[PDB]
Amino acid sequence: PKSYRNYSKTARNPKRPFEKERLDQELKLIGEYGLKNKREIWRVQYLLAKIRSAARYLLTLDEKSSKRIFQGEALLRRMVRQGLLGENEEKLDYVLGLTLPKLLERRLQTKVFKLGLAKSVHHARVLIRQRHIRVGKQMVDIPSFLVRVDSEKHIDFATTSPFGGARPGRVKRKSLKKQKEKTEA
Amino acid sequence: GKGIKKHLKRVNAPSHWMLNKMGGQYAPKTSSGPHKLLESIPLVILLRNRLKYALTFDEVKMILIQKIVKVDNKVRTDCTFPVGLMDVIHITKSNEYFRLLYDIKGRFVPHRITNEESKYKLCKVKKILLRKGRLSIAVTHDGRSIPYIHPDVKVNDTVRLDLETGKVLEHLKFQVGSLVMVTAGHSVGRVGVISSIDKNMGTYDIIHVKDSRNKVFATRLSNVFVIGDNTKPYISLPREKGIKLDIIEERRNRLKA
Amino acid sequence: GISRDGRHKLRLTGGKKKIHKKKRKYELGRPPSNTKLGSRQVHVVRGRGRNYKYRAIKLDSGSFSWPTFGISKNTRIIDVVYNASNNELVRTKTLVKNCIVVIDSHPFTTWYENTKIGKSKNIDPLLLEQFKQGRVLACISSRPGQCGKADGYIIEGDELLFYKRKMD
RNA sequence: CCGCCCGUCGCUCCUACCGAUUGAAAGAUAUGAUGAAUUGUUUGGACAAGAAAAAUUUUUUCUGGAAAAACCGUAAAUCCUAUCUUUUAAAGGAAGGAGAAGUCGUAACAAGGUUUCCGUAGGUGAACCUGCGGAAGGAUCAU
RNA sequence: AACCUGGUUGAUCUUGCCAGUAGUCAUAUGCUUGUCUCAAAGAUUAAGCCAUGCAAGUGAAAGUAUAUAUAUAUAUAUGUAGAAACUGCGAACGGCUCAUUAAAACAGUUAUAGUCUACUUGACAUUUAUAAGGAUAACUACGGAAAAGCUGUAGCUAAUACUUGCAUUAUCCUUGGAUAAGUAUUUGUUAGAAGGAAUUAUAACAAAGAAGUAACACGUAGUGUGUAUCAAUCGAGUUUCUGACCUAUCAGCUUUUGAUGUUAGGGUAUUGGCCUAACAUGGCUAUGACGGGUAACGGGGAAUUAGAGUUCGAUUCCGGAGAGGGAGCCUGAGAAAUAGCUACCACAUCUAAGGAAGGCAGCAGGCGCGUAAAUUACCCAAUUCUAAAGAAGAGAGGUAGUGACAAGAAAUAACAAUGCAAUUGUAAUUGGAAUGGUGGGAAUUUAAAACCUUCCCAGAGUAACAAUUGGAGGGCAAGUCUGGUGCCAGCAGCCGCGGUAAUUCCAGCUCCAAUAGCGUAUAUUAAAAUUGUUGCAGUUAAAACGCUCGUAGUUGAAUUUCAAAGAAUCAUUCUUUUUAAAAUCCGAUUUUGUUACUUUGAGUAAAUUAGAGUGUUCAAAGCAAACAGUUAAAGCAUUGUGUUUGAAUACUAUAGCAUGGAAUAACAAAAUUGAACAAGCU
RNA sequence: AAUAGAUCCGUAACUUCGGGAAAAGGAUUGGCUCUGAGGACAUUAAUGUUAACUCAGAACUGAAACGGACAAGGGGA
């Protein structure tokens, strides 16, 4: 028979392929956060739309209802744990005010750039892809990793990286080799 | 041909067995015996999935070959024998005793009773028959015939049965004040007392049960099991004592570190 | 062979059905037993769960009762005289459930030489005129094609008057 | 207005229609005729075990029992008729659409040079003309 | 995201369609392709035809071994193993496909007081005995046939195969006789703890009567095999109510030959026109019968949608049906079975020509058909099933091979210095670091097969380790740049371009869009308030019947108990109190028509869906997991022992079961008459 | 030459709606033994007497024959 494992999509197309303002705004965001395609913007938009839909549905529902209490507390806890709400705006009405730059600020790339530790956002993306970064004793190499609140104080270089106290790379060792046979003969 | 079916597919097995939806296309397909398929659990599931003693089916087999597992005081070697509600289990090698019960969800658990409690169980009466010579026989939920039943026993109350000898010790009536456990939909491990009985003529009888937190629920008559008099129960209960909280306060409790 | 399904009948509206199933062998209809007056003949046929029933092919005696007293006696069957379904079965002398037969009455008259508490029953005359010639009229009450036997009871009362008027 | 535009007729191309030929083909259903195989009951009786004094057997048998027949049933299949559904040939006849600089007239648009139009009925190469009753969507909101 | 643009004109405002736009667990095809994870795949057309190999077997205490082999103790005894064969059980489960089928099948909800039921579980029995019978396999000798899973004759011998058949008690009133001397089942006469309801359990009297209660095996006081009834369990056959697409150029069907009922029987496991005889004239229909069509198997579900809706569902699970087309049948607890048998129609195999054998819509594979679809591979290690039930077997199932169907992540650089228009930026030049892709060897994984993860060695500069597919007049982002052609060649979904100035053809350069992906064709959803219940139009744009009557349908005035007075909250929201009557506890509780409709419950399979928890390195996912410790503390049981967990909840017609009810609607009760009560009178 | 009596089924084109029509076509038929249906009258629903001729079914039977001789349409485009 067919396998019982399933799958789902994560993005969507804009329905209007040549609108000028949307295109300029997307280029703004891509150049600001150093991304690859329009697909990344579209996937973040998809996620935000799901969140907002849940919030709207709960807000229509009766005050001090059981379903409202349970699901609203769960959603607010998730949002505050992700690092998107804060402390004085956990009210299920500040969820509807969340914008795209809010979510797109939590990527490991932006965090690695902002925490010193890298000269540029493109440099940040290159370092993540070359196994130089850890998030709490686990080495991570995916720039779309979204950092949670209790994990943003453990970002650091990896112990197996030349930038974090290990042997140097394939270029240093070859230069040192060649220099050794030059200086011993 | 179109005869009796012999196989069971995994996604069609009863959901309270909690079988992985990967790793296989089949389920153990319990045998015929004292309990129905849907109100029971095979011995392989108990002894591999729950207690984690075996890692495969073949290890359950090599456990049961050496005759050390007794249900209701008799050794069994059938890997798909049905094990049912009030049944006591003894593993001689480890010197352990269990009784299956429902938790507040619909899933069976082994309760880990002691040795003195391991000498009896409770059976509920399903019907009473009159046979040749005007002798009475009782039929229990356990698929069991009891001859020479007491004249004051009716077709819905419960009795307490000795296991070394199949004789009756005492019986408990089915009244307004009796203590009950419920065994079907929407409320499967709930314990309450009883509030009222309805007795609709051609259709089902509805009865109401009041919890120890003054919560009220109702169900059919045919899924009610009397387990004590007004004061106290006659068996030990799992940790929760049949007290079902709702999701909000259950979640609140689970977050107490 | 013979089937007992209703897939080949017309609907109550008069329309006809389209068949998309073969015969299923759990609606058999095996042929009838036309039991006849003669020396004993019984065959065997098995049902579903290997339950046997006994086909009679020829019988000439059985167990007969006298309902007024509650006594049963073995006796011999002489002839069939009336069938209420059709008279083609009195035609060939076939035994079915509701037949009328004539039987030997000597065992019943002999047994009456003990006169259990019905000592004041005042046997009606028509039965006495029947007893004088040695033969009486009875009605079969078993199903010979299923049990392999033929039992009955003595006819009396308005029962007798009805069946006597029907036969003249 | 040196505007626009209508219909026959002649040429080419494509689509569909009527059509003698008791036209042709493939399936479906019903009635009839003949009917393989086989359940049941009856008939039959190669022979296998039986009761007889005799010496291994003479005709007597309660039994068991193969081939083979008959009858009532369950009924594949073949054929002959009768309708029905689908596809399809054709002398000849007669429409529509498209194309090309064709021939004849000028019916409509202005009071289009006889105001236009409706129903009906006649007639004429063609557009159309004429009788009878109606409308204004008229060229008159008025004596 | 509850959205609109180009095209009728000299120009304008409308109706109205044509074209543009986005998605498809939706198919085919063109160009292109570096890494990893996940995994659909001969349905559409031909339920067309098939070479070859495989797909169901089974003995670890316990039926029958002088085929034989072997071990000890001592010609003897106890053992162990065991090709054949008889016996027992299973092959009716599994796997495949969607031809038929339109009140049929199926789904929710009922009944069996109208039935059958192997294996498994619990109860538990009645009318020569120190051990009975005969006969048959395997085996031996003599054979036949071209050929086949063919078999003749003669001679032995076993069984849990096939048969026959022995030895004890309970009641009537510390005596005694009578007797019960009969399990299921059939007939006649009676009596009578449970269910809403009995011709119910059950008991008695008089006749029939199956089948049985161990002439079996092991050595663990125990088991194994077999056995009459009852009950349970795994199941099935029938059965109640409600629920489907298009068609009236289908209006009357059914009934001589069962159509609708009654009576009596037959038959079946049981009810029944299921069948047979006699009788009667019924049954369905404009609320669509009877017919026709479907490129129709039905559900759980899928796609797209603000809310309504529209369109799909051959295909993981459940139900139905079939094995080239029809019909018939044996065994068996279970079959109208097809890797069972018997015939006919079609197709086809071997042959010595006399004869004998056949059924891939099971797994691979071939031909044909077509726009349209993979290996004649490995394994029983996991999930399960069968058996004489650890130990054997399984194209069920798992693993790999092919595979841009579909889904998820993610490379093709980054940095510094110097120059250079504006702190930038980079058409540049220099120079050192960082990395996979790739080759080799290991630790692992796995039935010492290959992926993946992790280490060691080698290894980037034109980082040649070199990204594509469509476009550039408008709709619609992007060139009044060069050369060629000249109403030709060609382009263009639509409006349009093409005669020397072509922003549109053919090329070069440059720009634009999406990007390991991007175009084209057909079908379908939104756009479409262009099918309109929500929600369209009908003077002149398409469209009020010539006019009136009239049945079915749809829709219908007002009226019957309206109030009034306190408490709880920062006028509001809630909540108490009784005011007409009759029946009912020695100046008192509780009852007062039927539906619709609305509230709340019960019962329900998962997968899919919504949704709670949990860092697969993230995500798609999955249903798991978390905690202390270079090897002990700590806890709880007296030396012993790890601990805490999760796998929720909702949803499941419109019909059915129960339940609170004051408003809105319908019905019942209402006169050329109808009651209720005192009192005498049966 | 072939057909033809009677009973039971089934009948097209066309049409002046009256026909065509016995359209075309299919089945049956003896003898013997039985079963069922159809009236009148007088003692009172119950008993008793009493006819005539047709029609419908069943079993059995024979060298598969039966309007057995006589009598008696050929059909269609």
Ligand SMILES: [Mg+2]
């Ligand atoms: Mg079948």
Ligand SMILES: [Mg+2]
């Ligand atoms: Mg196993």
Ligand SMILES: [Mg+2]
């Ligand atoms: Mg004029």
Ligand SMILES: [Mg+2]
């Ligand atoms: Mg397939």
Ligand SMILES: [Mg+2]
């Ligand atoms: Mg198909």
Ligand SMILES: [Mg+2]
């Ligand atoms: Mg199957």
Ligand SMILES: [Mg+2]
């Ligand atoms: Mg009849």
Ligand SMILES: [Mg+2]
């Ligand atoms: Mg389907």
Ligand SMILES: [Mg+2]
């Ligand atoms: Mg299926």
Ligand SMILES: [Mg+2]
């Ligand atoms: Mg085939």
Ligand SMILES: [Mg+2]
């Ligand atoms: Mg078959």
Ligand SMILES: [Mg+2]
């Ligand atoms: Mg065949």
Ligand SMILES: [Mg+2]
């Ligand atoms: Mg096959």
Ligand SMILES: [Mg+2]
């Ligand atoms: Mg195949």
Ligand SMILES: [Mg+2]
């Ligand atoms: Mg393909």
Ligand SMILES: [Mg+2]
């Ligand atoms: Mg296994």
